[PDB]
Amino acid sequence: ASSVNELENWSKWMQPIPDNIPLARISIPGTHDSGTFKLQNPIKQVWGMTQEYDFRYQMDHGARIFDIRGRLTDDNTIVLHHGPLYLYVTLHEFINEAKQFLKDNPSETIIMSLKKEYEDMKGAEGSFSSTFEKNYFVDPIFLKTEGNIKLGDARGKIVLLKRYSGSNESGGYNNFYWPDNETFTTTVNQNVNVTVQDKYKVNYDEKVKSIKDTMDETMNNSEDLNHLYINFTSLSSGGTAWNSPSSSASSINPEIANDIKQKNPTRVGWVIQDYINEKWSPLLYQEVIRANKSLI
Numbered sequence: 001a002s003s004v005n006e007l008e009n010w011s012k013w014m015q016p017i018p019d020n021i022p023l024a025r026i027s028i029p030g031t032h033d034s035g036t037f038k039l040q041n042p043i044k045q046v047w048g049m050t051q052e053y054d055f056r057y058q059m060d061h062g063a064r065i066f067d068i069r070g071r072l073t074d075d076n077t078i079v080l081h082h083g084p085l086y087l088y089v090t091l092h093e094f095i096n097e098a099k100q101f102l103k104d105n106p107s108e109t110i111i112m113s114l115k116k117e118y119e120d121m122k123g124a125e126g127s128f129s130s131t132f133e134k135n136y137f138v139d140p141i142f143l144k145t146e147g148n149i150k151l152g153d154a155r156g157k158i159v160l161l162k163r164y165s166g167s168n169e170s171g172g173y174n175n176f177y178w179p180d181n182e183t184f185t186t187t188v189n190q191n192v193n194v195t196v197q198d199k200y201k202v203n204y205d206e207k208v209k210s211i212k213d214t215m216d217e218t219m220n221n222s223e224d225l226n227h228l229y230i231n232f233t234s235l236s237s238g239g240t241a242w243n244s245p246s247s248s249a250s251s252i253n254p255e256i257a258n259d260i261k262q263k264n265p266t267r268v269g270w271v272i273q274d275y276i277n278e279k280w281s282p283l284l285y286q287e288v289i290r291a292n293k294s295l296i
């Protein structure tokens with residue numbers, strides 16, 4: 001019926017996990033600034049590229065959480081950005097890829113974090129929130145219930161994680177105070193405690209210690225079913241080939257992945273990383289998925 005090796009199927013790893021487990025309890029791999037994979041200009045890459053492959057590659061590699069950053073256009077649409085850089089990717093584009101993946105692998109669910117990355121273009125009829133809700137969120141693909149969302153209810157749908165203000169529709173995880181460049185704790189959906197490590201602009205050593213500290217707390221609080229842990233291993237670019245997100249990820253990802261591999265924990269949280277690929281081993285996202293062995 002259900003075996004541990006089932007977690008090895010990167011395209012259906014959530015299948016063996018019971019329907020009653022809250023998404024917050026599952027250890028889920030995610031991608032930081034998910035839509036930056038089409039950047040080609042060397043200068044744009046060194047400063048703003050965080051992924052080498054598209055959404056489907058990311059999903060087929062086990063990623064279930066996507067960090068989508070968008071901008072409202074004068075044509076009532078949302079396109080992806082990284083700062084002032086247009087990424088040649090649209091919100092409709094992401095949703096469509098998620099839909100196809102969910103169709104092929106109905107046992108899974110896609111968690112979509114959405115944040116306003118750049119000021120709306122002048123001439124928009126509505127706001128960032130109103131436009132997203134009216135032209136995108138109305139789609140049945142989006143889960144409309146909240147609370148401590150369970151896997152069973154999320155399968156086959158996209159679970160929204162709001163990082164924008166002004167929301168008016170229900171569904172997914174509500175928006176909450178997200179202080180800049182810090183590790184913090186607060187609540188979400190009234191009955192869910194949330195801890196986030198998002199120090200994106202600290203020195204290398206401080207970042208690694210912060211990742212390990214938050215992961216240590218997660219590994220030791222494995223039965224807390226209503227606590228959500230979001231751990232970003234990504235670091236902002238230094239502008240050179242030695243401190244770009246690519247270089248930072250090449251050293252941080254294997255380091256953290258090795259921690260998990262050696263400890264063999266039962267929970268490591270929602271681990272959001274830069275550059276999901278199969279170059280540097282151990283591979284972080286795979287170890288994160290394997291940490292769900294006790295849920296089976």
Ligand SMILES: [Mn+2]
Pocket residue numbers: 033082
């Ligand atoms: Mn960024």
Ligand SMILES: [Mn+2]
Pocket residue numbers: 054056057
């Ligand atoms: Mn592709």
Ligand SMILES: [Mn+2]
Pocket residue numbers: 193224226227
């Ligand atoms: Mn707690």
